[PDB]
């Protein structure tokens, strides 16, 4: 079996996948599922081979025995002659975002506000913010800390999914895939920009990438950077330019995960695949571009220069980092998770 | 060893072979095996010398180091003046064939349909259709694409062998030799003519050759040309008369293969052998006709005028054509093969 079966989450990621298969000549093929946890189960079960996960989902995959393969790398500030595949990975900035018009909304005034999230169990939209909120309150009532939220993945009949809009017919409310209007980085931002929520937990890069006409989709083009403000742990409301000291935490990059037995092969294929269809690649933009999806961060983030290597075969722990592992572990004492609990025997 | 040891597949091909031996005065003799792969292994091992293979089987033979010797060549409409052994080869038309009666079955609704095939790994019955289906779906789960199939050679306990009937006691279900009821071109057709399947992947010529009493065997004689029809890649359902732009792909002719050292010998013996017992032959029909097989396409196709030479020194690649070689290679990224793996190994 020399093909690598990519798991796509939802029809958008699935149609991109379909193309990737065709252009790579079935070097890559596609399994599909509604949610990322379903895909993690597909990879567990041998019906798929690999997928690109947010660090939060990498915690779950690693609890189920999967390992990381290749990290994402995005344009750096240091500017290095070292090649993208060899350049050290940077992290990204998890930040809270508000409309500047809503004054008097600081860190310490978030209770009973409407919040927007990428999805449940992701790093910027959930793990870091909710972990911090639980730490301060001394309470596991993250479910009742906000009046309403949109957090795809949560209990669909809960208040954490009250704000999620579904697709366009309004169906599949709060499924954690891009079919949902407010899924993901982009979706949490949109959720804020149409003021369905008061704060959005995203990354630094989302704010710039969707403001000042960088996205010429409906909601986004008209958006404006100065109308938005980064809440800090201190209690301030700084502008987006001040992200380097107004960030909630530093988040490990979305990385590819696979089973151990299939790791080295998947890496191989992917290293070559990005040569063919990556940023500066032979068939990019002729036949297919792997890291470009028309602003929907499909399969990978759109701002991915390339997939960088890692040192050795790292575990999910080494990759994510002892301290982020602990922050996650602690947030998860507040909440049992089916996939996590079914797998919990693998690490005892 | 001036004898050419022909490999026969099944007792049916074996008993025709036997006669061919006797009349040719042991200029040719017979080895036997259950399947075509087994015969290719006999040629590898020096235990046989040559046999006539479908283009798909020629790819496998070529991965194991065998070379083509003489193509089959069929009654043409054009050129027709250069003698048969010197006439350029034309290819053949791989087509999908359905009962006309079954409306609402085009190309794009073949999922969950019942399929009939010549055998696994052949050009018209397997490689071209499945290759396209895998390309369309972006998925290597071709085994689960059709509800049931008959594809001799597949895992006999699988669903791709569910429909195959065996011989007459029903034994040897789904072995890819003519003793199984739905093996080969003819066998795929019949699988349709008795509606055990909904589509059959065969060549143009099979359709005419079994309809309108062109065959006076049981199932075939009563057939009508217009009760069967050809699905197109566009999605149409045009007549068999319309084969020329409702063809799935162009198929390289069934060719004889041998080991590389024995090629030039086998050629001469065969060119002389067809002079003796061929279409236009001194001992045909008197004592033996090499290209007539009791309507069972034994050893060679029945519509074979003769064996034509090949241009230059061809590899299995050159003969089949750079593009169909790739169509095969990709479909085989979805499936490991024992003989191919042993040959990817031992010859290197
Ligand atoms: C699909 O995946 C295959 C498998 O990796 C890719 O084919 C491989 O790519 C190149 C193109 O010929 C070959 O690599 C080179 O081989 C030669 C030795 O002859 C040498 O320059 C280097 O050692 C280098 O590795 C390799 O032979 C080839 N593999 C096969 C089996 O042909 C292919 O590029 C991928 N295509 C797409 C569209 O994804
Ligand atoms: C927060 O996210 C934004 C958006 O990704 C980051 O800004 C981006 O930073 C890179 C590197 O600093 C910029 O590239 C630089 O731009 C100049 C063009 O003047 C170019 O010559 C250099 O080669 C260099 O790559 C990039 O333009 C910029 N993106 C946008 C949309 O402005 C920012 O660095 C992040 N902030 C923190 C604190 O990490
Ligand atoms: C089996 O194969 C051998 C070939 O190796 C056949 O032997 C050949 O038999 C013919 C006579 O039938 C000989 O032909 C000669 O041709 C010239 C014309 O250029 C003529 O002048 C001679 O008088 C003679 O007719 C030929 O020499 C001979 N070849 C060998 C190598 O001995 C044999 O007939 C084949 N038998 C069957 C049943 O296939
Ligand atoms: C699809 O397959 C059918 C059957 O294999 C092809 O029809 C056959 O075509 C040959 C050559 O065109 C015909 O031979 C002709 O016979 C007549 C005598 O009646 C003669 O006038 C011509 O000189 C030529 O020799 C043959 O009769 C015909 N067979 C049948 C049963 O109709 C057809 O050409 C194939 N079409 C495509 C597009 O591949
Ligand atoms: C089949 O794959 C080819 C490349 O091998 C691609 O160009 C084509 O688009 C694929 N088929 C379809 C229906 O897209
Ligand atoms: C809160 O602070 C940090 C989380 O940022 C954590 O290390 C610490 O254990 C927590 N303690 C309490 C009492 O919440
Ligand atoms: Fe993330
Ligand atoms: Fe064939």
UniProtKB/Swiss-Prot annotation, chains A, B:
Annotated hydrogencarbonate 2 binding sites = 118, 122, 124-125
Q: Does the keyword Iron apply?
A: yes
Q: Where does Fe(3+) 2 bind?
A: 54, 92, 185, 254
Q: Does the keyword rRNA processing apply?
A: no
Which ranges carry the Transferrin-like domain? 4-333
Q: Which GO cellular component does the record give, naming just one?
A: early endosome
Give the GO terms filed under biological process for this record. Answer: antibacterial humoral response; antifungal humoral response; bone morphogenesis; innate immune response in mucosa; iron ion transport; negative regulation of apoptotic process; negative regulation of lipopolysaccharide-mediated signaling pathway; negative regulation of osteoclast development
Q: Where in the cell is it found?
A: Secreted; Cytoplasmic granule
Q: Which residues are glycosylated?
A: 27, 135, 204
Q: Which UniProt keywords apply?
A: Antibiotic, Antimicrobial, Disulfide bond, Glycoprotein, Hydrolase, Immunity, Ion transport, Iron, Iron transport, Metal-binding, Osteogenesis, Protease, Repeat, Secreted, Serine protease, Signal, Transport
Which cysteines pair up through disulfides? They are: 7-39, 17-30, 64-343, 84-306, 116-191, 140-334, 150-164, 161-174, 232-246, 284-289
Share the record's PTM remark.
Poly-N-acetyllactosaminic carbohydrate moiety seems to be needed for TLR4 activation.
Gene Ontology molecular function terms on file: cysteine-type endopeptidase inhibitor activity; iron ion binding; serine-type endopeptidase activity; signaling receptor binding
Per UniProt, subunit arrangement is: Monomer. Found in a complex with LTF, CLU, EPPIN and SEMG1. Found in a complex with MPO and LTF; interacts directly with CP, allows Fe(3+) incorporation into LTF and activation of CP ferroxidase activity.
Q: What does this protein do?
A: Transferrins are iron binding transport proteins which can bind two Fe(3+) ions in association with the binding of an anion, usually bicarbonate. Lactoferricin binds to the bacterial surface and is crucial for the bactericidal functions. Has some antiviral activity against papillomavirus infection. N-terminal region shows strong antifungal activity against C.albicans. Contains two BBXB heparin-binding consensus sequences that appear to form the predominate functional GAG-binding site.
- What is the similarity comment for this entry? Belongs to the transferrin family.
Q: What is this protein called?
A: Lactotransferrin
The scientific name of the source species is Bos taurus
Identify the coding gene.
LTF
In terms of the parent sequence, the fragment covers 361 to 708 of 708
